[PDB]
Amino acid sequence: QLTEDQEVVLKQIWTHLFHLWQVPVDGTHIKIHKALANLDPQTTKKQFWHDIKNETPDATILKFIRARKWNADKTIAMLGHDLYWRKDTINKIINGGERAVYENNETGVIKNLELQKATIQGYDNDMRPVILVRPRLHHSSDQTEQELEKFSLLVIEQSKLFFKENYPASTTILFDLNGFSMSNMDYAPVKFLITCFEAHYPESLGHLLIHKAPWIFNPIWNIIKNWLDPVVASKIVFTKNIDELHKFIQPQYIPRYLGGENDNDLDHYTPPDGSLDVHLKDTETRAMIEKEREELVEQFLTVTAQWIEHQPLNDPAYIQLQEKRVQLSTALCENYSKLDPYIRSRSVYDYNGSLKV
């Protein structure tokens, strides 16, 4: 549940967005904000409801709220900044999948995929997806910085598709520094990933495991820890052996070469063959599913405005309004479930049985 104060914060954020989108609502019983004064209303509305996939709208907005310590103005500033930067890039990346990268011959992205530099390798003890990162296979020589960033964005969005209902909507990251050397070091993408993840994936980091760091890493760490927010800086734990990793991940997901039981082939990549993408061209069904979504979206807005004006928090009408918001939230996530085969090219995880949307 949520408290009085917290709910009022949530109501305020939805109110600001409603003012941007021209949704009737009265926010006094709980004009366009500075943070949203320079955004296009319908661009932002369509992009926001697209990026809503397997989390409920309330959970999506609460990530920003908690990221800004429950300060409404801070929260709406961060959310407007994200809406400005995101608009349609990421959605195109994740929906195109590896297939689009191959078809467009994006050499550096392809190289990163084929090295399996960063792969989703299972779930942690709290049911978060685990991205395994192996920096000993990194060379700044292998890709543009834009390429490395697009690759980063694709793996992070892939991870989001693994989020499980009733479990943290966040990703654990295992940096295996075995055999890492300064040949592999690249400060630019370090700092990119830090600031972009901080500004655009709030509350999306679960555990950050730095495993078998060599001595040459101590000075690197002295730099990176001063770029890190304190939130992330103690999401961070240094692990030395399989017994430490067991505190965070079960052996069935830990790669065999680390002492675990996961025998996934990390030295040879199998790219999506496209076998599972047959729904991508039945555009008629897809349009019907998107019409369903748009109807649910309008209903959710209407009910949400109702709930923001309703008094008191006692009311049986309040009971009903809350329950309706929950029901429409669930229906939106099921609708995304149904939409996914019609807009998203299958990833390697859809083929190897590990991802179910």
Kindly report the three-state secondary structure assignment for every residue of the chain. Answer: CCCHHHHHHHHHHHHHHHHHHCCCCCCCCCCCCHHHCCCCHHHHHHHHHHHCCCCCHHHHHHHHHHHCCCCHHHHHHHHHHHHHHHCCHHHHHHHHHHHHHHHCCCHHHHHHHHHCCEEEEEECCCCCEEEEECHHHCCHHHCCHHHHHHHHHHHHHHHHHCCCCCCCCCEEEEEECCCCCHHHCCHHHHHHHHHHHHHHCCCCEEEEEEECCCCCHHHHHHHHHHHCCHHHHCCEEEECCHHHHHCCCCCCCCEHHHCCCECCCCCCCCCCCCCCCHHHHCHHHHHHHHHHHHHHHHHHHHHHHHHHHCCCCCCHHHHHHHHHHHHHHHHHHHHHHHHHHHHCCCCHHHHCCCCCC
Q: How far apart are the first and last CA of the chain?
A: 26
Contact 83, 59 (CB under 8 A): no
Residue spans of the domains in the chain: they are: 4-87+278-351, 104-258
Q: Determined by which method?
A: X-ray
- The verdict on whether omega for the bond into residue 312 sits within 30 degrees of 0, i.e. cis, is yes
Task: Tell me the CB-side half-sphere exposure of residue 317, using CA atoms within 13 A.
Answer: 9
Scanning the structure block, which residue is given the tokens 């003012």? 19
Distance CA 234, CA 237 (A): 7
Token representation of residue 322: 């809350």
* Residue 146 identity: Q
Q: CA–CA separation, 153 vs 199, rounded Å?
A: 13
| C-beta neighbour count of 263 within 10 angstroms | 9
Distance CA 297, CA 285 (A): 18
Give phi and psi for 162, each to the nearest 5. Answer: -80, -15
Q: Measured between alpha carbons, how far is 204 from 202 in angstroms, rounded to an integer?
A: 5
Resolution of the solved structure (Å): 2.2
Q: Which residues contact 336 (CB under 8 A, 6 or more apart)?
A: 52, 53, 54, 293, 357
Q: Which residues contact 356 (CB under 8 A, 6 or more apart)?
A: none
Pair 264, 116: CB distance under 8 Å = no
Query: Which CATH class for the 104-258 domain?
Result: alpha beta
Pairwise CA distance, residues 47 & 44, whole Å: 5
Q: Exposed e or buried b for every residue in 175-210, given b needs 16+ CB within 10 A?
A: bbbeebeeebebeebeebbeeebbebbbbbbbbbbb
Q: What are phi and psi of 37, to 5 degrees?
A: -70, -20
How many C-beta neighbours within 10 Å does residue 91 have?
Answer: 17
Q: What are 223's two structure tokens? A: 């730099």
